[PDB]
Amino acid sequence: VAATSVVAWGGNNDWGEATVPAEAQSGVDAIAGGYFHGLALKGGKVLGWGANLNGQLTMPAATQSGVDAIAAGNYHSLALKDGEVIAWGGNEDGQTTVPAEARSGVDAIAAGAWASYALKDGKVIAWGDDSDGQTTVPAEAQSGVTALDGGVYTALAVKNGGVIAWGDNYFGQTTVPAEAQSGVDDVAGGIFHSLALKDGKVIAWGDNRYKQTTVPTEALSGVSAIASGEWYSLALKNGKVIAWGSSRTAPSSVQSGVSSIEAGPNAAYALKG
């Protein structure tokens, strides 16, 4: 749904990643938050703002039109165009070198801090940094997957309503709770915590020193969407955004009328429809 306005908040906006320029303030149906930049999808065209030290904002010609989805990591950007995954920006860890199988048939993408993921025919394909095992896909996630997401040192997937998680597990962010073995509809990975949306209920596990897994009561039912930054989380319920972790809260501007949310490492974004 095309937004009529966009609200961004959280973090220090040190790189200008939380300032959505006028051109992306309306008509955009998607936003992807990177560490130093932001991307937006407008009429199939990829827009961007923020820092471009690694060329993550030097849009490839092919993204000027027909793009269906976008994602952003620490130094790179991803776009999905007619089943093909397009990548650009920093490539120190091979995160922008798209493998052959991800050049067609892909129906979803997600970016990790230094990694890229494609979902095609129920199979998760990953590339880029693997120093924490975040890009070594478990056998289970290689078939029947319906949703995926990338974290900083991790990645998550939904298969037959059950969560599959891999990468760093220092704080238990990859130990899937019994409750998330079925009925799960979406996942979101934080730096040391993880989220699952199960029939309107937000389930969280992993680190809690900064309250990341202390789910507000209101987010225990009727939630239609979730998103995770590094140290904070978001839930969308009846057009109202709910935030928790690291003292993050939701300003009054996103208390109503929000049709979709996006969480960058630090900056949160709400698309008002």
Binding site: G11, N12, N13, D14, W15, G16, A18, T19, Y35, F36, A51, L53, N74, A113, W114, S131, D132, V152, Y153, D168, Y170, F171, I191, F192, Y210, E230, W231, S246, P265, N266
Partner: protein
């Protein structure tokens, strides 16, 4: 005195307190000021003092810029873009300072704080340097809390500016260390919408910005035309309800005033 006008107008626009001090790098003479002796949270601007202390140790041979430090998941706190990428390979003291100063990496600052013994030790460093005002009490990210009237983790514009001048030109650090400190500040990556945005071509600026809670925002800088620094400028603000962009803009405009009447 047109910069003074703009500074006071910044308080009008932001509905908050603004502290300002402009020093002549050479004579160390105060050229202009506003609320020079009131306290403000340093936020990340303290990282330049922290690395000053680190370099002092390198100079005395108690530390090595190339010494590699390995840390764990347990050391990471928010706003640590560089350190979060080096859990496996670690980072050298030099790299930690570059990250703390040029990217405001919180974890890097915490790691460096540990190499000197903690926040009390940085405060000890400041005292023995002649700065009995500037104080660091907590670690990242807590030190950015900026609760009103709280003096923890604060400095005064005149104190910070004086201390900055002593570090960049005094005999406190060797010539090599003074140059490395100013090099890190010149390589600052998170201050473009501040003084740098009002800077015309050919000007030199070495700075360190800071952002915190409850509207706290700030910057310390050594700048000058013709690729050479000739003045120290310190600006702090706290208490505003305005967006970060609106606050950046006011600081930028103060910068424009400084430049237009330089």
């Amino acid at each position: 005195p047109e910069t003074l006008v703009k500074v006071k107008d910044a308080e009008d626009q932001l509905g908050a307190r603004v502290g300002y001090i402009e020093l002549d790098l050479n004579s160390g003479k105060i050229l202009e000021s506003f609320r020079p002796e009131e306290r403000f949270p340093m936020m990340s601007t303290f990282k330049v003092l922290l690395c000053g202390a680190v370099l002092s140790r390198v100079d005395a041979g108690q530390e090595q810029l190339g010494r590699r430090i390995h840390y764990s998941q347990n050391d990471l706190v928010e706003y640590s873009p560089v350190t979060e990428k080096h859990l496996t390979d670690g980072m050298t003291v030099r790299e930690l300072c570059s990250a703390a100063i040029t990217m405001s990496d919180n974890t890097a600052a915490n790691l460096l704080l540990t190499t000197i013994g903690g926040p009390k030790e940085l405060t000890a460093f400041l005292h023995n340097m002649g700065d009995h005002v500037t104080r660091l009490d907590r670690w990242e990210p807590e030190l950015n809390e900026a609760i009103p009237n709280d003096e923890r983790d604060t400095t005064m514009p005149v104190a910070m500016a004086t201390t900055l001048r002593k570090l960049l030109t005094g005999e406190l650090l060797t010539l090599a260390s003074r140059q490395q400190l100013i090099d890190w500040m010149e390589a600052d990556k998170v201050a473009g919408p501040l003084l740098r945005s009002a800077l015309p071509a050919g000007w030199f600026i070495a700075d360190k910005s800071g952002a915190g809670e409850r509207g706290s925002r700030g910057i310390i800088a050594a700048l000058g035309p013709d690729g050479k620094p000739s003045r120290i400028v310190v600006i702090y603000t706290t208490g505003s309800q305005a967006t970060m962009d609106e606050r950046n803009r006011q600081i930028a405009e103060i910068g424009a005033s400084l430049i237009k009447h330089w």
